[PDB]
Design a protein around this nucleic acid. Structure first.
Ligand SMILES: [Mg+2]
Ligand SMILES: [Mg+2]
Ligand SMILES: [Mg+2]
Ligand SMILES: [Mg+2]
Ligand SMILES: [Mg+2]
Ligand SMILES: [Mg+2]
Ligand SMILES: [Mg+2]
Ligand SMILES: [Mg+2]
Ligand SMILES: [Mg+2]
Ligand SMILES: [Mg+2]
Ligand SMILES: [Mg+2]
Ligand SMILES: [Mg+2]
Ligand SMILES: [Mg+2]
Ligand SMILES: [Mg+2]
Ligand SMILES: [Mg+2]
Ligand SMILES: [Mg+2]
Ligand SMILES: [Mg+2]
Lengths: 116, 70, 104, 118, 66
RNA sequence: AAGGCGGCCCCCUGGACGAAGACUGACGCUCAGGUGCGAAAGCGUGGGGAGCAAACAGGAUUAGAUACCCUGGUAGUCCACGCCGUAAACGAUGUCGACUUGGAGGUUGUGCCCUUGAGGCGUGGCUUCCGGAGCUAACGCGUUAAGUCGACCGCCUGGGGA
RNA sequence: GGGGCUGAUUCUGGAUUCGACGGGAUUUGCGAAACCCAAGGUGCAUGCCGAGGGGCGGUUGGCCUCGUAAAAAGCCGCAAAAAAUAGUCGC
């Protein structure tokens, strides 16, 4: 394939599931791994251990493109905002930027009704 | 909150700096506040109750510490 | 009259038409027996965000005393002139004389 | 001469050291102007050896406002190798509030008599 | 210790972009009066100046955005 | 004024408040009937329709669950014209006006004093908290009164039935 | 068109911002990595090896110790100026 050097990480931690996706700099998603696919279902995958083993599955997924640099764009609230990039430090690609790309509307579309 | 790494700064320190920066810039707090639609009467009423408790503690600590208790 | 204050950004490829914009808008203001007080070309400037997929822009400030009809003629010619991306017209109470805080 | 009016309403002082700064002669034409400040003269003492914080350099500004001496300058204080071990151990734990008590001279410099206000 | 009352400025201009960058923060928000110390009238004129600079793209709407 | 009003810019426009002056010279207050404005939901006509979402469908929990919770989802929300005239339309406190110990702040002017640094001495308007005598069934209100009074208006005479 | 006023310290004057934080230098007095020097104090010992340790990470290329296989020392951030966790009950 095309063994590129730099990658970007996308950590879409939400309130139930945590998805890690190594893309390139340009935008094509190279590899991905989910905390729901990494060996859990239902109650377990809203814990940051599930996020860190999702990042380990993703390290398996792109330990062959020659990724030697990796900036991380975390998104959303929930479990795996911090322990996911802890696991990416364990995986060992270099981290330059740790940016937060959480979509905050400036009072835009109406959120749903409050769960009793 | 784009946060670079600087040289001779280990990643535990860089992640702590990102943590405290995102926390004080208010991403978690604002997603938890904009998850569900807090109806405008509950907005005004929660604000009034927060103002009541804020003024009440900031007055009542003097109104309780003006004496001895031991 | 009033004290309108017009500050507008021009497409960076049309940056050499801009002295023609200076002359034409000065003449279209002064022909209505209306004064014109200060006038600055800030030059090209890098933007905080891409406005219409574009990252440098040519800033022009002017402070005009003119009637409202020729001010609104200037506003529709700003909206129908392609070279200008954004244009603000702010009604100030007092007419200025001094220098802008950015040029220094 | 000068005086601060931030904590002038507020409390008194327990300790007195003859700790003046060595404020430079880039500000003589603003020293002999009258516009007083010893404003926000909180000093913190550390491995930088008694950094004062944010000294407003007298905005008369006769030097065409580029560089008179500084907009705000940090500067150190004139005490002993033993007194700046005592005050070192006193200051370097809690983020204290200290302040100058006056602005006068002994014919050479602008003398500061420091003190903490609990 | 409001700097507008400490430098006596009558009407706050919107093109002193460094003195507005003092009062926007790391994300592009507006630091409140609990953190600066401005009197509320100059805080509101400051907020209007920040909105005019943000529409004129002198300042950014958010530090992230492109 | 009440409902209410929240990015920025322009056009039209009402009101308030402050300062020294000037002026008209009781022109004032309240107001039955009468009129005007009056959130949201609703209706009519015609547009729009991203989100949200009564009705509705499916999934569960349940003894059943025509509900909460989940996945969808049409009215409606929105724009212009109208109609309805109702709300715990609340400060559960009609308007106007006078007099009566104080403190804490906020807000918006303004006078003076050396703004001698981000001060200090007063006068206005508006506004939230604590509280005195007074009052009150008590709670509490307390110079913005539920205090002491005056003018005019509205309303109540046991709970249901209603 | 000249004279006086700012070369701040009434000049025949010696740091005096007592000692700042870093100096190029000298007598004094006390450490073995400040030292000539013992077997001067002291013996199964020595210099240089290698490797591992506070709820978590970092820090001494070193504090402590060990020899054919894995263990005990000194310090920081981990919110206390408004703050972090739970379906099933009808009479
Ligand atoms: Mg939901
Ligand atoms: Mg008369
Ligand atoms: Mg009537
Ligand atoms: Mg409606
Ligand atoms: Mg309709
Ligand atoms: Mg119907
Ligand atoms: Mg329709
Ligand atoms: Mg639709
Ligand atoms: Mg009714
Ligand atoms: Mg209401
Ligand atoms: Mg109410
Ligand atoms: Mg009523
Ligand atoms: Mg009575
Ligand atoms: Mg009371
Ligand atoms: Mg009464
Ligand atoms: Mg009563
Ligand atoms: Mg029964």
């Amino acid at each position: 394939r095309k063994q590129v050097s730099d990658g970007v990480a996308h950590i879409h931690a939400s309130f139930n599931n945590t998805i890690v996706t190594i893309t390139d700099r340009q935008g094509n998603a190279l590899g991905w791994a989910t905390a729901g696919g990494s060996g859990f279902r239902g109650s377990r995958k809203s814990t940051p251990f599930a996020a860190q083993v999702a990042a380990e599955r993703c390290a398996d997924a792109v330990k062959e493109y020659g990724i030697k640099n990796l900036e991380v764009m975390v998104k959303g609230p929930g479990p795996g905002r911090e322990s996911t990039i802890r696991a990416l430090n364990a995986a060992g690609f270099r981290i330059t930027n740790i940016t937060d790309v959480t979509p905050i509307p400036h009072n835009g579309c109406r959120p749903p009704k409050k769960r009793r | 909150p784009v946060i670079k790494v600087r040289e001779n700064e280990p990643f535990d320190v860089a992640l702590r700096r990102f943590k405290r920066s995102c926390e004080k810039a208010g991403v978690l707090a604002e997603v938890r506040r904009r998850e569900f639609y807090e109806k405008p009467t509950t907005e005004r009423k929660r604000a009034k109750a927060s103002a009541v408790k804020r003024h009440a503690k900031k007055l009542a600590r003097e109104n309780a510490r003006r004496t001895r208790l031991y | 009259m009033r004290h309108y204050e017009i500050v507008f950004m021009v497409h960076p490829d049309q940056s050499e038409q801009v002295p023609g914009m200076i002359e034409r808008y000065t003449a279209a203001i002064t022909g209505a027996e209306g004064k014109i007080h200060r006038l600055e070309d800030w030059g090209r400037r890098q933007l905080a965000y891409p406005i219409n997929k574009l990252h440098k822009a040519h800033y022009v400030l002017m402070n005009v005393e003119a009637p409202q009809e020729v001010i609104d003629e200037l506003e529709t010619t700003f909206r129908f002139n392609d070279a200008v991306i954004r244009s603000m017209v702010m009604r100030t109470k007092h007419a200025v004389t001094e220098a802008s805080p950015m040029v220094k | 001469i000068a005086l601060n009016k931030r904590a002038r309403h507020e409390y008194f002082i327990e300790e007195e050291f003859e700790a003046g700064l060595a404020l430079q002669g880039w500000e003589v034409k603003s020293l002999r102007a009258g516009k007083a400040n010893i404003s926000d003269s909180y000093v913190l003492l550390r491995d930088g050896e008694a950094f004062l914080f944010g000294a407003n350099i007298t905005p008369m500004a006769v030097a065409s406002t580029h560089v008179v001496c500084d907009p705000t300058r940090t500067r150190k204080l004139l005490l002993n190798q033993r007194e700046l071990d005592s005050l070192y151990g006193r200051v370097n734990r809690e983020g204290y509030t200290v302040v100058a008590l006056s602005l006068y001279w002994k014919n050479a410099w602008c003398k500061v008599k420091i003190g903490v206000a609990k | 210790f409001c700097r507008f009352t400490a430098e006596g400025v009558q009407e706050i201009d919107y093109k002193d972009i460094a003195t507005l960058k003092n009062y926007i923060t790391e994300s592009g928000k507006i630091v409140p009066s609990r953190i600066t110390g401005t009197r509320a009238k100059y805080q509101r004129q400051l907020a209007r100046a920040i909105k005019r600079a943000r529409y004129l793209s002198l300042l950014p709407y958010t530090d992230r955005h492109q």
